[PDB]
Amino acid sequence: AEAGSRLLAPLKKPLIVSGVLQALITLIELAPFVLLVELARLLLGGAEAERLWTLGLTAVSLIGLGAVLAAAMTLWLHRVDARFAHELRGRLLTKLSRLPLGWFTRRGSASTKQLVQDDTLALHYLITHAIPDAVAAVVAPVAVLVYLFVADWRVALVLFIPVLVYLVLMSVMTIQSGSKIAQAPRWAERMGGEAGAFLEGQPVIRIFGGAAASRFRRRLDDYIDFLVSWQRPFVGKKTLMDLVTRPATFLWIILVAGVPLVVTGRMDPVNLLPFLLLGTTFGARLLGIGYGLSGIQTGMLAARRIQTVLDEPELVVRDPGTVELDRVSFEYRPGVPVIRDVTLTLRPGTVTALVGPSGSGKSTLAALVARFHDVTQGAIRVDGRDIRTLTADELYRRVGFVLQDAQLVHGSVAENIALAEPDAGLERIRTAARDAQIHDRITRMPDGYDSVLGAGSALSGGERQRVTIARAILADTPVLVLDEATAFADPESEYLVQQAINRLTRDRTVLVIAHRLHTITHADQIVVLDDGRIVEVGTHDELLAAGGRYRGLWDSG
Amino acid sequence: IRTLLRLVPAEKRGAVAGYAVLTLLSVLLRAVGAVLLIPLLAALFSDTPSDAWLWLGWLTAVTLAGWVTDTNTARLGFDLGFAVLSRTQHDMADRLPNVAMSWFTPDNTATARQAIAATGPELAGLVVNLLTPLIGAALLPAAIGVALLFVSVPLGLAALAGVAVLFGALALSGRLSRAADKVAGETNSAFTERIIEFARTQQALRAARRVEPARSQVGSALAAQHGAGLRLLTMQIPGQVLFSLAGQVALIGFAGMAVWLTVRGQLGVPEAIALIVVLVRYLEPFAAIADLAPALETTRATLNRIQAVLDAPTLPAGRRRLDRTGAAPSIEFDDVRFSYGDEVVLDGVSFTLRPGNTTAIVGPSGSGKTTILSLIAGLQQPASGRVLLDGVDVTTLDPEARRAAVSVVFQHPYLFDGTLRDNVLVGDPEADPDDVTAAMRLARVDELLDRLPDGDATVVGEGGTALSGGERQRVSIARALLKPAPVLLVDEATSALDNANEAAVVDALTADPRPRTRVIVAHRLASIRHADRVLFVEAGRVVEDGAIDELLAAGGRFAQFWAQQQAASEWAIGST
Ligand SMILES: [Zn+2]
């Protein structure tokens, strides 16, 4: 809750100055109505034309002053916001360079885009458009009320009769629909999910048909009927609520309250003129306060999200490829362990395999070996040194990893393959590529190794996977954290990726996240994780002889 | 912009006419109320305020008629809003099933989902929250201009001619504001696009030890862009500020003109004061229209999304139908061409499938193999050429006959919230229990029922038991087998970890008693070992065509593919 206000801490004084300038500008914008009242005052008094000319000069000067103040405030506020947002984006760049790699996978690409590109724009709108607009929408009705009360209180009180009627009707409406107001967001979310399902199941509707369309149609009809039943009985209250705050109603009330007073001599006729000028649209100004403050909340949500990401824990640097998991345990959230006191010793040159049922947390342990997250308890040591004490530039020359959803840096193919060692000569790049079974397709490209890769490219999934495998081969890390989902991610080119992985796994301490048992039987060490902890350890033949948990998985295949 | 006329159903068209007439009456009553301040304030500020009673009576007679008319327009507004909501939602729901599958782009799907979901409560009160205030505020200044003709011809003509200038100023202000917001969004996106790339590729940069040089490069780029952007800031009046300035200038200028006429003796002082008040009444609606800028923009966006969904390219229809015999149809391709875009997916593919003979479609071209099945099923029409089923073109085929012609096993299972039997029964709900049991047996679902606690009645999919891929694929195969289609299309995208799913597919291919032609897009040895003939689709064209043994003896590309797949099946890490 405090995060949103804490992000905007340095902008307290610029925002206060902006609020003061906006209050002054808004009061200046209401100046010509006061000047018109005084114009009527001195017209009925038979003032000389020189005084009227001076009053017109004053009005023109105030109009120009208000325009200049608004332009200068907008320029200064946009400049201050431009400086602050640049500093914020620098902080975000630095933060994303030190958050753990596993933070990104949980969020995904859409959440990162929402954080960096959408919320940072909502913050710009908050600083430069929302706060000044809200200040104007709060200053204008208050100033109007004060001025009308100063003009005359008897006619100012009757302005609150329609306001009181509006508030009473709104209160009666709100209590009478207490449950439906809470239900409506839930039903909207349900209908959004059902619309997504209906759009996703289009081929089944086209080929098979049947209830796939009726399931959506019945619930859409139910939602529409819910809305109609909710809002239909309030037509009686809502039309009256709209009529009460209408400008014509305010004008009628003002005139029927003022003309008896003016006729009876209880009020100066000039004192009614402020009510006719400013008082008619007062109700519409009161209703505009809510939309003014809506922007502040909509921006503060974005500020809260940005600060919450900026408060995320970072990686802590405390203090031939043997990995020693020593009493390692891990929990995604506090109090929900996923890995529970696992012990392992990945010896050099031994292709350890990690196998288990779905949701067993094998992927989590394999990720923890590469320090996608910091182990909550225990410690993971590579070559006798805890991974916590290793910096990123020194850790990832010891523990390489080839997991699912490989990522290509924008640039030439020679850059993507040589990302770990840009200084490597082109002959070494081609040797690494040929070792990864991707030399043929790279030569097939028009520019060859100079072809520019990125987010979108002609290469399929199974080919950019082999490009990443070529990168990993050229990096030549002693330890390797391999995921077997890369093998069958692209069934069209499974054989080439399997050959690439075979060439990559050559005299390296590999940790395979097993998904198919039949590709693991030759592994040096099998690890069976039933639920967040080791159950059986040993070779394939030993586990088959044991006849325990592993035998059922082997029989299933 | 004016898409709303076609949204309302024909039933409420009389109500729309009544609403329009009553809105015009409401505007006229409001204008007469505003113009009635001329004699009322003229008498009020004179030496005999008691003469103001008659004009106050006329004003409060125009009011209460304003209330009656506004009540009627608001009632018709709520009625039309509910009617438009129901009609548009049902029409949009009916349109989408007939839309060609090519239209369902991810962005198109997103807009369709937003149109179906986000437009629930908006259309309920669209006409009452936007159209009525907008129309009233737009026509009131012109209505006061016309009504001022009776007070005085030159004054009314000037007031009516000045409405165009103020509307032009309002349009210019809106244009400037929209341009400024668009430029701000574009600049922010350009600034942050570096960081999005830096975060997307974070694993590659970190693992390659390039995170620090990459961060330094991104920071330098951000610094340079910030300096360049901050240098170009200069004095500029926003759109809203410009319009407020225009309104204040118009008010003070016309008040000064009234003062000039007063001192020259053309108008009395009470008349000048009344004209100033009517001036404020005349300039008030423009502020109301400017207040409706965000709501109007949101409604325009929603109407654009609804129009985009409704304007989707509908597929054609035909009268002719396949034979009711239900025998295996022979499928023929001739000069068939198809493309997802700049890349061609099919380039003159032509072949003929014998009736009842299995056909295996294999090759590196992943899109083309599925595209052939889609063309056979009729989901996507071919750009060129024809698709035939026993001398009947799919494009000219009856939609009901097309639906009953082809059964498909999609790559995804495409299940839904409900019982497993309900999911399997949707292929053919009219089937007897024995046929359903046979479909479950051939699809190897009985083993799943043994695994499941409550049998086929178990709730699966979005609730109950969350079935894995190997189970949901079997459920989809049961769906396809249950439907008595003359044609079966199989698309294998199964997770390689499954064991019994391959057996289920083999049983569906071979052990099915239904004599139906089968086309299978497969990657695994067991499924295509039973195929009678194979089509090798590469580079959007058929390179090989023949039987299994003939192709293997020929030693062409299919033999190399067979060797590669056989080697891939026996893969083991840490071994030759
Ligand atoms: Zn801005």
From Swiss-Prot, chain A:
The chain holds residues 316 to 888 of 908 of the full protein. Residues 323-556 form the ABC transporter domain. The gene is irtA. It is a multi-pass membrane protein. This is Mycobactin import ATP-binding/permease protein IrtA. Residues 16-298 form the ABC transmembrane type-1 domain. The lineage of its organism: Bacteria, Bacillati, Actinomycetota, Actinomycetes, Mycobacteriales. Its EC number is 7.2.2.-. The import function of IrtAB is contradictory to structural predictions, which suggest that it has an ABC exporter fold. It comes from Mycolicibacterium thermoresistibile (strain ATCC 19527 / DSM 44167 / CIP 105390 / JCM 6362 / NCTC 10409 / 316). Residues 36-56, 151-154, 264-271 are periplasmic.
From Swiss-Prot, chain B:
Residues 20-298 form the ABC transmembrane type-1 domain. Residues 331-564 form the ABC transporter domain. GO terms for cellular component: plasma membrane. It is a multi-pass membrane protein. PROSITE patterns: ABC_TM1F (PS50929), ABC_TRANSPORTER_1 (PS00211), ABC_TRANSPORTER_2 (PS50893). Its main location: membrane. SUPFAM superfamilies: ABC transporter transmembrane region, P-loop containing nucleoside triphosphate hydrolases. Keywords: ATP-binding, Cell inner membrane, Cell membrane, Membrane, Nucleotide-binding, Translocase, Transmembrane, Transmembrane helix, Transport. The chain crosses the membrane at residues 25-45, 48-68, 126-146, 147-167, 241-261, 272-292. GO terms for molecular function: ABC-type transporter activity; ATP binding; ATP hydrolysis activity; ATPase-coupled lipid transmembrane transporter activity. ATP binds at residues 363-370. Its EC number is 7.2.2.-. The ATPase activity of IrtAB is stimulated more than 38-fold in the presence of Fe-MBT, and more than 10-fold in the presence of Fe-cMBT. It holds the Pfam family ABC_tran. It comes from the Bacteria. Residues 1-24, 69-125, 168-240, 293-576 are cytoplasmic. Residues 46-47, 262-271 are periplasmic. Disulfide bonds: none annotated. It is found in: Cell inner membrane. Belongs to the ABC transporter superfamily. Siderophore-Fe(3+) uptake transporter (SIUT) (TC 3.A.1.21) family. Forms a heterodimer with IrtA. In IrtB the ATP-binding domain (NBD) and the transmembrane domain (TMD) are fused. The IrtAB transporter assumes an inward-facing conformation, which may represent the low-affinity state after mycobactin release towards the SID and the cytoplasm. Part of the ABC transporter complex IrtAB involved in the import of iron-bound mycobactin (Fe-MBT) and carboxymycobactin (Fe-cMBT). Has a preference for Fe-MBT over Fe-cMBT. Transmembrane domains (TMD) form a pore in the membrane and the ATP-binding domain (NBD) is responsible for energy generation. The import function of IrtAB is contradictory to structural predictions, which suggest that it has an ABC exporter fold. This is Mycobactin import ATP-binding/permease protein IrtB. It comes from Mycolicibacterium thermoresistibile (strain ATCC 19527 / DSM 44167 / CIP 105390 / JCM 6362 / NCTC 10409 / 316) (Mycobacterium thermoresistibile). The lineage of its organism: Bacteria, Bacillati, Actinomycetota, Actinomycetes, Mycobacteriales.
